[PDB]
RNA sequence: CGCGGGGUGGAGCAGCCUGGUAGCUCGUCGGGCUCAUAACCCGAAGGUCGUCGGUUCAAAUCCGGCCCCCGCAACCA
RNA sequence: CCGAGGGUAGGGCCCGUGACUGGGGCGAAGUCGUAACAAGGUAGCUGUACCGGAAGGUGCGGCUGGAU
RNA sequence: UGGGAGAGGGUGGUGGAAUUCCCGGAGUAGCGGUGAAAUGCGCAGAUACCGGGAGGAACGCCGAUGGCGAAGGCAGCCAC
RNA sequence: CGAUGUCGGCUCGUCGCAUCCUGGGGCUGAAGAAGGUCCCAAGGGUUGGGCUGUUCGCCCAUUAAAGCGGCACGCGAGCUG
RNA sequence: GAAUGCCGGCAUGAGUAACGAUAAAGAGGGUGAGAAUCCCUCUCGCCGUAAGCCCAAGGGUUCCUACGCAAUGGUCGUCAGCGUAGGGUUAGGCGGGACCUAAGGUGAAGCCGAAAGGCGUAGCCGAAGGGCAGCCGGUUAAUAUUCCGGCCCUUCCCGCAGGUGCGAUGGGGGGACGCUCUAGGCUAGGGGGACCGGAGCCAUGGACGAGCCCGGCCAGAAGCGCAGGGUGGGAGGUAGGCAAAUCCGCCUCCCAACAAGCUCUGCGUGGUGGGGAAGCCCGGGUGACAACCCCCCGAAGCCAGGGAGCCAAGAAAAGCCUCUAAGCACAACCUGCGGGAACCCGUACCGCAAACCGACACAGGUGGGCGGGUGCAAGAGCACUCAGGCGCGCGGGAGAACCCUCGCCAAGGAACUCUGCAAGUUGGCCCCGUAACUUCGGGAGAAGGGGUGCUCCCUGGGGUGAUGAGCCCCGGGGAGCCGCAGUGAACAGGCUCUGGCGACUGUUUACCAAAAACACAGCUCUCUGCGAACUCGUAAGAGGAGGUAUAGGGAGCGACGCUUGCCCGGUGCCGGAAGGUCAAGGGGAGGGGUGCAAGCCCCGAACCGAAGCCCCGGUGAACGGCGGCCGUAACUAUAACGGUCCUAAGGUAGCGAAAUUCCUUGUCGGGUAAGUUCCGACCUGCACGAAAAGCGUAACGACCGGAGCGCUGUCUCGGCGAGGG
RNA sequence: GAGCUAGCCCUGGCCAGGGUGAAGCUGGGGUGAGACCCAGUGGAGGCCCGAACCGGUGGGGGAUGCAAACCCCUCGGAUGA
RNA sequence: UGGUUCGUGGAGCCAUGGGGGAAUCUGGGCGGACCACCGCCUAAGGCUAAGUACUCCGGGUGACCGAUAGCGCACCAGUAC
């Protein structure tokens, strides 16, 4: 049957992307936390 | 003269449709249309705020002249009567001798080829617009400004009309289409005659899909829902109301008046409505 | 021996709660008016209060037991 | 090939009969009231309408086959 | 051909009397109703009187024992 | 109750005897035939249908007879639902 | 030593289940240490509206080549989407950007919010919509509308020539529109040829033939040809299109009019450039100077912005054209020609799947285009086949029980069972024929029946063409032939009668319920006079609605028919300027503390004092409710009638053992051999009843009940056979 | 977090083939004129049969599955909510 | 209304959303309702080291751990998944 993951590059970048995160107070905390934790990637990979 | 159909589908049994007999032109003026943004009953939050809206046929809004005192004294000619899907009345196209073109609500019995005009000196004649204080007592008028220069507010749907009852100072006494008696300022404009297409109320929609064409989605009874949804929700089997009949939001819906108590127009309502 | 209500002139109901008193409508009996009957008018009689036992100076009335009659309930499985 | 008739299937008319049900006629002395006949004690009749244990009553319009 | 009388019929318009309701004034202890009553209504101000307003229906006197129509039926007044 | 799946049916049996039939008897208000009642006996047998989820029961047609109970109201790691 | 403890290791079940669609395999020859499994050849089978081809999304080297087989691959492995290395994606015209705008997003102005932030006109962003210039062939191991060849075209800059009041983010035109049905003429595609080209073939009884087999085109600028779309010209006035306008809109005048003219597309033709089969012998080469022609069928595509009808009334903006303003008329724009200039990103490969989403090389899921032929009435259905692609990554045997999927069955024919569950039957098309009832449409494919192949002969109308022949499409009659059987295989209703419920088509518990449930047109009540009510929001602001009582919100009821009774005492709502009660506040009778005192400070009665409540009325398609005991008639029985108690009033019509009835399998009737179900009645209705509507209702239903006919392995009662295990 | 699912908004796309044959229109009949009837034409519809497509009715299989909802037969809608 | 130990308490003090609304030392606030007496202090402007907190960083030391311990990571770890 049709499952839950149906990838879509524009969707991905526009929902979880760097510019979406920077626009909003909670998004900047996501970025702040993932830097303090030392994540190699602050935001999902999508090829644009 | 609403039109019936033979019973060759279950729905054709009862469906009735307007005769469209007065319409003389079947596409609108390219210069007087604009796109009508369907809302689905959602506001700028994206939230539904008027339930059960959406899915209607695409429409173009026709710009309608509800002022008409824009052009005191300039006579116009009735070039066409047209179908307008944004209202129940028909609409009329006016070619002013100006060359300017406008749409107006089509009063009852207005004829293609005749002329209308706006102003204090205008004849008392079907289609003309005058400040209320110059229209003789007893006259049947439509498209009535509620306040001077603010725009024609009252008696605009198919077949409605207001009747001029008397004068009192700067104000005129009107009997609205609801039967209420009200003071309306004398300089407010009005148009002689009743709104046309009076048979509009005798159309029989005949099937559910027809309501879907109009943008009306199906309405769910409170008694059909669950307690988390509605005051009438729940119950084993069917259930009577079991409380004063209420809206989804809890307020009483059989008799409970809701006009605001201290509203300033109260000094202007003479008698409440009828029937 | 699940929980309620009732039993009082001939019928249908008060009085019981708050102990001392039996009442109301109809019906029945006698006499009027009527040619006569009903209606109407004047008078009259009939009830020891389902029963037994206790309390009391005194029980339709308060408390126990027995009879007779109506009503409600009987769920989770 | 036609063909008596037999078989299958589906209709039309008539008769008899059926739990139960609707009124109808009739029947020496049943129960309830008293609608009509006199101005019958609300003049009656009437077409229709609504209502009521029953006759009836009432509305609307009509008739004199009504009286003083 | 020229004349007449008529509530003959259909459409539009339109006049006054009267009842009801509404508003304003004025005014107070009852009004209404019946064979007699009670219900009802009235000091939260009724009835009775005046001014204004709204609305529907029916056309007094003329009018008659009258007139018209095939019958049912037809009555303020104006015009078609 | 850190689970002993619970009615009826179907399938498959097995057992008890307080015996429905078949076998052997006594008594009889046992003439015969046919019954009634009690005793011995569990080897074998104990049908097909209509109704109801039904167990049970009533009915139809038969029959030598259409027995009554136990096996976790026998049997859901065998089926049904 | 225990915590169904935690982490790790290793046992048991066990050489057990399983190795993933039952589309299917066999042999020869290669290679290699090793071969059912890799490569090649012949045979066989499977898909073919796909299981073939082209796009898009997603994936991200998986593509090509060489060398490899530890692990990955459900077995094997020499093979591979695996490991190592090298190689591979080429654009002014394709797609996106340097263009347009849609929802929406954002947002100078502005508005709002303790903060964070929320709004918001224009404007900006935003596409699979608008707009816009490239077609055919060749070449690589691997890219190609990109490289190459042939022939075309677009914009930008600059120069020359001719022309013109040139000039814009501004004004206008246009762009620019739905659904169903559809004309003319074409193209795609397809069928046939006794004509044209071709390597060959003659078999096993016949055939050297008007035999077999194969192939008979594609792209193209200007020009012309056919078919279409778009489109009035001139003049005078002019107050309107937020300045101006010679433009547009309005009025009048003359001419033009189913046309023509000008314009713009499509198709055909076209200089020219390409392609080219079988067979054959090593993707190649030959064929081959390949030929390339005629007839038919024919789109849903093209001409297109075509036509008609209908109601539910069918984006925007730019490019483009026209108008003028500032300005500039050495300029600038238009037209024709010439030279130059022309950037960024994608391009490999998979793509109904072993490379995408499902932990797997997973029988599931995934949007657009092409989708050939024959027969079957048609078709994208069904059967077989073209091109192309496969045989599904464990095999070999055996021929038990039992299981799955499938075939048949003597006599019986629902006896099975909760239930005909299941499986049979029926099954397309042509004709004949068809009932109650009905809202006159329907019920209807009612039911039930007959026909259906092939051959010869005669004949009717149509399409193309030319009216003829040919091709092709509908048919009509007569005479015969064969079989058990002619929609001979495949695809393709079993039917009737009668109840309950719901009018109906629809909708639902993704993944145990599809229904009688929700919805529905329609009916009623009620709120709402517009800055509406109502809804979301602290707000600003939105929705409602660019709507205005024939409108919008809320509620119940549920097509339609005939109807919807009595109770307003309680609760609700609605009306009531009296009266009663009532808060803060006003008022301050009279008290109290402190000071020597002026004064400061505290308490406080009466009285004035809203909504709400009380009280007075109204109101049921508002919440709701609609009696008990006893007596009575000239057989009995039963009570039309009466008596009395209680209520706010004591259930009317209609219906009733019901989707409701406990006693209950009520009683009687029908159907059956027999009927706790069914149907029709009755009425002591435990505990129907009139918009939580009452009683009916034609049509409808994968709803639930009862009966009959047809037919059956459901069953008496089982047997045999097939394949996967 | 609305790349699943639910509703709405903007813009696109898709629905083989066959069947039934409403209104209107034309002609004819009819009448004072009408209503209306007949024939032809016409192509309406939450119309009918049936693929794609969307569903998920009954049964069987599956049940450490091919699959954490699948498979086979059967069945509903298929110009419209 | 908040703050303080103070939860309405005899409830002052400090702060302040609403209403009313002075004075310039003979002016004003405080000493826990209020008055008197006696005292303390000068609101409605601003700034001001040090002593105090912490440990991303560097070093010093452990009756701290010693690869299931010690940080989640002794190791190419905020990685693989
Ligand atoms: K329970
Ligand atoms: Mg899904
Ligand atoms: Mg998606
Ligand atoms: Mg994307
Ligand atoms: Mg995308
Ligand atoms: Mg997206
Ligand atoms: Mg977002
Ligand atoms: Mg982003
Ligand atoms: Mg910040
Ligand atoms: Mg890094
Ligand atoms: Mg992130
Ligand atoms: Mg109709
Ligand atoms: Mg009809
Ligand atoms: Mg009209
Ligand atoms: Mg437009
Ligand atoms: Mg426009
Ligand atoms: Mg809007
Ligand atoms: Mg918004
Ligand atoms: Mg949000
Ligand atoms: Mg709403
Ligand atoms: Mg809505
Ligand atoms: Mg409207
Ligand atoms: Mg209109
Ligand atoms: Mg006004
Ligand atoms: Mg309506
Ligand atoms: Mg609409
Ligand atoms: Mg509605
Ligand atoms: Mg509803
Ligand atoms: Mg409910
Ligand atoms: Mg519910
Ligand atoms: Mg919720
Ligand atoms: Mg709640
Ligand atoms: Mg609630
Ligand atoms: Mg409720
Ligand atoms: Mg409920
Ligand atoms: Mg209930
Ligand atoms: Mg419910
Ligand atoms: Mg109710
Ligand atoms: Mg209730
Ligand atoms: Mg309520
Ligand atoms: Mg409210
Ligand atoms: Mg009003
Ligand atoms: Mg008492
Ligand atoms: Mg006493
Ligand atoms: Mg007495
Ligand atoms: Mg005598
Ligand atoms: Mg007497
Ligand atoms: Mg014979
Ligand atoms: Mg007697
Ligand atoms: Mg009488
Ligand atoms: Mg009499
Ligand atoms: Mg009389
Ligand atoms: Mg009398
Ligand atoms: Mg009466
Ligand atoms: Mg009185
Ligand atoms: Mg009084
Ligand atoms: Mg007074
Ligand atoms: Mg009135
Ligand atoms: Mg237990
Ligand atoms: Mg355990
Ligand atoms: Mg267990
Ligand atoms: Mg069985
Ligand atoms: Mg014996
Ligand atoms: Mg004997
Ligand atoms: Mg004997
Ligand atoms: Mg014995
Ligand atoms: Mg035995
Ligand atoms: Mg035995
Ligand atoms: Mg039984
Ligand atoms: Mg039992
Ligand atoms: Mg029983
Ligand atoms: Mg015997
Ligand atoms: Mg037993
Ligand atoms: Mg037991
Ligand atoms: Mg038991
Ligand atoms: Mg068992
Ligand atoms: Mg089981
Ligand atoms: Mg069982
Ligand atoms: Mg077990
Ligand atoms: Mg077992
Ligand atoms: Mg067990
Ligand atoms: Mg069950
Ligand atoms: Mg221990
Ligand atoms: Mg464990
Ligand atoms: Mg543990
Ligand atoms: Mg342990
Ligand atoms: Mg563990
Ligand atoms: Mg380890
Ligand atoms: Mg372990
Ligand atoms: Mg191990
Ligand atoms: Mg092991
Ligand atoms: Mg082992
Ligand atoms: Mg073994
Ligand atoms: Mg074993
Ligand atoms: Mg296994
Ligand atoms: Mg497996
Ligand atoms: Mg298969
Ligand atoms: Mg198979
Ligand atoms: Mg196959
Ligand atoms: Mg072989
Ligand atoms: Mg082989
Ligand atoms: Mg091998
Ligand atoms: Mg090998
Ligand atoms: Mg193999
Ligand atoms: Mg090979
Ligand atoms: Mg061979
Ligand atoms: Mg094919
Ligand atoms: Mg991947
Ligand atoms: Mg290997
Ligand atoms: Mg290996
Ligand atoms: Mg190696
Ligand atoms: Mg492996
Ligand atoms: Mg595998
Ligand atoms: Mg090798
Ligand atoms: Mg090797
Ligand atoms: Mg490559
Ligand atoms: Mg190029
Ligand atoms: Mg550039
Ligand atoms: Mg833009
Ligand atoms: Mg912030
Ligand atoms: Mg954007
Ligand atoms: Mg853009
Ligand atoms: Mg685009
Ligand atoms: Mg568009
Ligand atoms: Mg392009
Ligand atoms: Mg080209
Ligand atoms: Mg090469
Ligand atoms: Mg110019
Ligand atoms: Mg347009
Ligand atoms: Mg439409
Ligand atoms: Mg054509
Ligand atoms: Mg072509
Ligand atoms: Mg063809
Ligand atoms: Mg001008
Ligand atoms: Mg060649
Ligand atoms: Mg050559
Ligand atoms: Mg198409
Ligand atoms: Mg087109
Ligand atoms: Mg068109
Ligand atoms: Mg726009
Ligand atoms: Mg100048
Ligand atoms: Mg110059
Ligand atoms: Mg020019
Ligand atoms: Mg650039
Ligand atoms: Mg690039
Ligand atoms: Mg490429
Ligand atoms: Mg698929
Ligand atoms: Mg692949
Ligand atoms: Mg595989
Ligand atoms: Mg994979
Ligand atoms: Mg797969
Ligand atoms: Mg071909
Ligand atoms: Mg066919
Ligand atoms: Mg295979
Ligand atoms: Mg396959
Ligand atoms: Mg396999
Ligand atoms: Mg094997
Ligand atoms: Mg074997
Ligand atoms: Mg055979
Ligand atoms: Mg058989
Ligand atoms: Mg049979
Ligand atoms: Mg048979
Ligand atoms: Mg049966
Ligand atoms: Mg049985
Ligand atoms: Mg069943
Ligand atoms: Mg069959
Ligand atoms: Mg068949
Ligand atoms: Mg019949
Ligand atoms: Mg019939
Ligand atoms: Mg029938
Ligand atoms: Mg019927
Ligand atoms: Mg009919
Ligand atoms: Mg048939
Ligand atoms: Mg037929
Ligand atoms: Mg024949
Ligand atoms: Mg043959
Ligand atoms: Mg069929
Ligand atoms: Mg339904
Ligand atoms: Mg339903
Ligand atoms: Mg119903
Ligand atoms: Mg109905
Ligand atoms: Mg449908
Ligand atoms: Mg479900
Ligand atoms: Mg569920
Ligand atoms: Mg679930
Ligand atoms: Mg299911
Ligand atoms: Mg359900
Ligand atoms: Mg269904
Ligand atoms: Mg539902
Ligand atoms: Mg509903
Ligand atoms: Mg319905
Ligand atoms: Mg209404
Ligand atoms: Mg709110
Ligand atoms: Mg706030
Ligand atoms: Mg708006
Ligand atoms: Mg209805
Ligand atoms: Mg309905
Ligand atoms: Mg309902
Ligand atoms: Mg009827
Ligand atoms: Mg009634
Ligand atoms: Mg009441
Ligand atoms: Mg009341
Ligand atoms: Mg009340
Ligand atoms: Mg008050
Ligand atoms: Mg109640
Ligand atoms: Mg009550
Ligand atoms: Mg009954
Ligand atoms: Mg019964
Ligand atoms: Mg019933
Ligand atoms: Mg009941
Ligand atoms: Mg019963
Ligand atoms: Mg029962
Ligand atoms: Mg019985
Ligand atoms: Mg019987
Ligand atoms: Mg029955
Ligand atoms: Mg009875
Ligand atoms: Mg109910
Ligand atoms: Mg029905
Ligand atoms: Mg029916
Ligand atoms: Mg249905
Ligand atoms: Mg259904
Ligand atoms: Mg049945
Ligand atoms: Mg049957
Ligand atoms: Mg049968
Ligand atoms: Mg069998
Ligand atoms: Mg086998
Ligand atoms: Mg999306
Ligand atoms: Mg989604
Ligand atoms: Mg569209
Ligand atoms: Mg379709
Ligand atoms: Mg047909
Ligand atoms: Mg026809
Ligand atoms: Mg037409
Ligand atoms: Mg349909
Ligand atoms: Mg059909
Ligand atoms: Mg299924
Ligand atoms: Mg599905
Ligand atoms: Mg089945
Ligand atoms: Mg499962
Ligand atoms: Mg399946
Ligand atoms: Mg199937
Ligand atoms: Mg279709
Ligand atoms: Mg269908
Ligand atoms: Mg639609
Ligand atoms: Mg504190
Ligand atoms: Mg505090
Ligand atoms: Mg304090
Ligand atoms: Mg303050
Ligand atoms: Mg001082
Ligand atoms: Mg001072
Ligand atoms: Mg202070
Ligand atoms: Mg102090
Ligand atoms: Mg002190
Ligand atoms: Mg101090
Ligand atoms: Mg410091
Ligand atoms: Mg140590
Ligand atoms: Mg370690
Ligand atoms: Mg560690
Ligand atoms: Mg350690
Ligand atoms: Mg660290
Ligand atoms: Mg570290
Ligand atoms: Mg660790
Ligand atoms: Mg570690
Ligand atoms: Mg790592």
Pick out its properties.
part of a larger assembly, 2 chains, A: about 50 residues, mainly alpha, about 0% strand, B: about 280 residues, mainly beta, 7-stranded antiparallel sheet, 4-stranded antiparallel sheet, about 25% strand, RNA-binding, Ribosomal_bL34 (chain A), structural constituent of ribosome (chain A), Large ribosomal subunit protein bL34 (chain A)
Please provide a written account of the structure:
The structure is cut from a larger assembly and holds chains A (48 residues) and B (275 residues). With 48 residues, chain A is mainly alpha-helical. Chain A has helices spanning 9-16, 18-22, 25-36. In chain A, 52% of the residues lie in helices and 0% in strands. Chain A is built from three helices and no strands. Chain B has 275 residues and is mainly beta. Chain B is 2% helix and 24% strand. Chain B is built from one helix and 17 strands. In chain B, the strands form five sheets. Chain B has a seven-stranded antiparallel sheet, with no helix packed on it. Chain B has a four-stranded antiparallel sheet with strand order 7-6-5-8, with no helix packed on it. In chain B, strands 1-2 form a two-stranded antiparallel ribbon. The chains hardly touch. The site of one magnesium ion has 6 residues of chain B, from loops. Chain B: Belongs to the universal ribosomal protein uL2 family. Chain B: InterPro entries: NA-bd_OB-fold, Rib_uL2_dom2, Ribosomal_uL2, Ribosomal_uL2_bac/org-type, Ribosomal_uL2_C, Ribosomal_uL2_CS, Ribosomal_uL2_dom3, Ribosomal_uL2_RNA-bd_dom.
């Amino acid at each position: 049957m049709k499952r839950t993951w149906q990838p879509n590059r524009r969707k991905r970048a526009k929902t979880h992307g760097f510019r979406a995160r920077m626009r909003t107070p909670g998004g900047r905390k996501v970025l702040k936390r993932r830097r303090q934790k030392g994540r190699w990637r602050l935001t999902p990979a999508v090829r644009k | 003269a609403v039109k019936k159909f033979k019973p060759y589908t279950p729905s054709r049994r009862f469906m009735t449709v307007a005769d469209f007999s007065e319409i003389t032109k079947t596409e609108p003026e390219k210069s007087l249309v604009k796109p009508l943004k369907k809302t689905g009953g959602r506001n700028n939050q994206g939230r539904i705020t008027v339930r059960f809206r959406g899915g209607g046929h695409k429409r173009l809004y026709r710009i309608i002249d509800f002022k008409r005192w824009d052009k005191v004294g300039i006579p116009a000619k009735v070039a066409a009567i047209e179908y307008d899907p944004n209202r129940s009345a028909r609409i009329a196209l006016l070619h002013y001798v100006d060359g300017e073109k406008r749409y107006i609500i089509a009063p009852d019995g207005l004829q293609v080829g005749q002329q209308v005009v706006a102003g204090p000196d205008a004849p008392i004649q079907v289609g003309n617009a005058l400040p209320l204080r110059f229209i003789p007592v007893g006259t049947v008028v439509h498209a009535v400004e509620l306040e001077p220069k603010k725009g024609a507010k009252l008696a605009r749907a198919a077949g409605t009309s207001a009747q001029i009852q008397g004068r009192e100072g700067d104000y005129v006494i009107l009997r609205l289409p609801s039967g209420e008696l009200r003071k309306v300022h004398g300089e407010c404009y009005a148009t002689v005659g009743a709104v046309g297409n009076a048979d509009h109320k005798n159309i029989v929609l005949g099937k559910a899909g027809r309501s879907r064409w109009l943008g009306r989605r199906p309405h769910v009874r409170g008694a059909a829902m669950n307690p988390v949804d509605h005051p009438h929700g729940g119950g084993e089997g069917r259930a009577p109301r079991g409380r004063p009949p209420a809206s989804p939001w809890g307020w009483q819906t059989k008799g409970l008046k809701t006009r605001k108590r201290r509203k300033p127009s109260s000094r202007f309502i003479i008698a409440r409505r009828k029937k």
